[PDB]
Symmetry: D5
Subunit: 58 residues, 10 copies
Amino acid sequence: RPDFCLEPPYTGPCKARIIRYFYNAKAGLCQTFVYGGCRAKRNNFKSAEDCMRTCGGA
Amino acid sequence: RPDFCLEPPYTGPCKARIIRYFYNAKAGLCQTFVYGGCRAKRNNFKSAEDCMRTCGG
Amino acid sequence: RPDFCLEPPYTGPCKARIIRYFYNAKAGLCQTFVYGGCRAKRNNFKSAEDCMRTCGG
Amino acid sequence: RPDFCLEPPYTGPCKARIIRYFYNAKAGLCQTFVYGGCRAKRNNFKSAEDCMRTCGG
Amino acid sequence: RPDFCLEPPYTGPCKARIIRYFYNAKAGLCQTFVYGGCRAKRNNFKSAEDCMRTCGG
Amino acid sequence: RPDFCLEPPYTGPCKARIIRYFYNAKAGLCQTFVYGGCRAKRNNFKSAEDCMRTCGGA
Amino acid sequence: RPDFCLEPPYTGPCKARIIRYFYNAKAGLCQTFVYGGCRAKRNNFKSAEDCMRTCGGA
Amino acid sequence: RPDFCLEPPYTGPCKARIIRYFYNAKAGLCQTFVYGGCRAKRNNFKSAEDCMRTCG
Amino acid sequence: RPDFCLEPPYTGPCKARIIRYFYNAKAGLCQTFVYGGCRAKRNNFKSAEDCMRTCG
Amino acid sequence: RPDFCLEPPYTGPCKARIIRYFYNAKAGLCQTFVYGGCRAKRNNFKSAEDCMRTCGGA
Ligand SMILES: [Hg+2]
Ligand SMILES: [Hg+2]
Ligand SMILES: [Hg+2]
Ligand SMILES: [Hg+2]
Ligand SMILES: [Hg+2]
Ligand SMILES: [Hg+2]
Ligand SMILES: [Hg+2]
Ligand SMILES: [Hg+2]
Ligand SMILES: [Hg+2]
Ligand SMILES: [Hg+2]
């Protein structure tokens, strides 16, 4: 998996309350977090399918 | 039916207000609850189809 | 993990070609398959989040 | 539970292949079927939430 | 028509502000209301198609 | 309601098999039909909410 | 086009913050507005395709 | 109005049958067409909001 | 690239909190911003496909 | 960017006709392809936002 999959989730400075997915390398799966709407980092997926595929395997 | 289906719904600490589904054992069907956006337990489904099949029967 | 997470994915006899998710116990991850639209088995999820969470651990 | 919940699912004459939900009384939950796109009967829900609440209990 | 189609719409005690559909028996049509996310009554539809079809006739 | 709400549903010449809604003035509600993807007439709604509101009352 | 296409957008008294489309007759196209979730008037569409087709032309 | 807004809708060579939106310069509005799933030209919108705003 | 692609994202005066896409000319790609629900400028896409194709 | 962003799009052996996004490294952006529903490779995204963020830059 890409190293960015090891990043902690990043809400960002904006004020929306949007459900996004991040890879939790300890749990070995993707989990939800609240994304603020701007300045996303790469461990942030709109689709849980994309999170699993991008980050699931190494 | 998995045992996690018997747990009460868990909103969690986060501040989003997102519709999710949980199995209500007492009622014998899936129902809606408000999910906060993080730290979900297993009695938590984005899709009602998934909730029924996983926790029903 | 629910035992149904260990079932091979099941398309069924119907003629739709719908993306669904199943847990691959060998690979230890959810993957897509083509669902026919009827007679689903339990290792079949509309949502990928539901697949990962229900069939993880 | 409305009586229409006890009818078998009805695909109809049209040629689309669309996932819908119907209540399976024998099984005591909603299930998927393929809907053709026209001439629907009432045991036909776009949303699984709607199916459970309308036909469950 | 199911009798539950005659219930006034019910927001419930939860704090989400989600669009749902209800049948207005007086007007003879489905209309929107704001659903709070928990303790739904049956005159509550995620899909407008489901509302019209379930509560029509 | 607009007169176009009295039109019979129109699939059109294209080959997609898309669910759309039309107002059935006899039934007094909107029903599904299969839309082909092109050359829509006005009694054709992507959302069933829009069909009810646009065509429901006179 | 139906005369309801000439009305200003109507949020209504309810407290949701939902994106809907209204036809802007001066602009000749549909635009977004915030709908409150109840007491809709007819110049209010869930889908932009529906808005533009219904209030399309003359 | 971007010049690509005046181009005819392009289905392309692929075999999917998916509703997309295109701006019809003559009609003065966005309409539906069938998109094959690959090699999209720019007069091709998944969202009708985007079509009207971009091309209208 | 249409010139509107070079404009900064515009939230507007309305009170909704909705994810939209804008083309960031500097970064050379589309990114998310919060849109208030009214008075959208053209560098505003509901679909990221439309943003990349239109502005990329 | 992850090296999987360099692979050509992969339809796979299954028979569905689903729209997915792949990163076109030469073009510098994501484009649509038809996915068959199984045996996905990693340059395959349900959401265009995810594709562009994951395979974004270098
Ligand atoms: Hg996967
Ligand atoms: Hg089921
Ligand atoms: Hg999870
Ligand atoms: Hg329910
Ligand atoms: Hg109907
Ligand atoms: Hg209505
Ligand atoms: Hg149109
Ligand atoms: Hg617009
Ligand atoms: Hg593109
Ligand atoms: Hg991005």
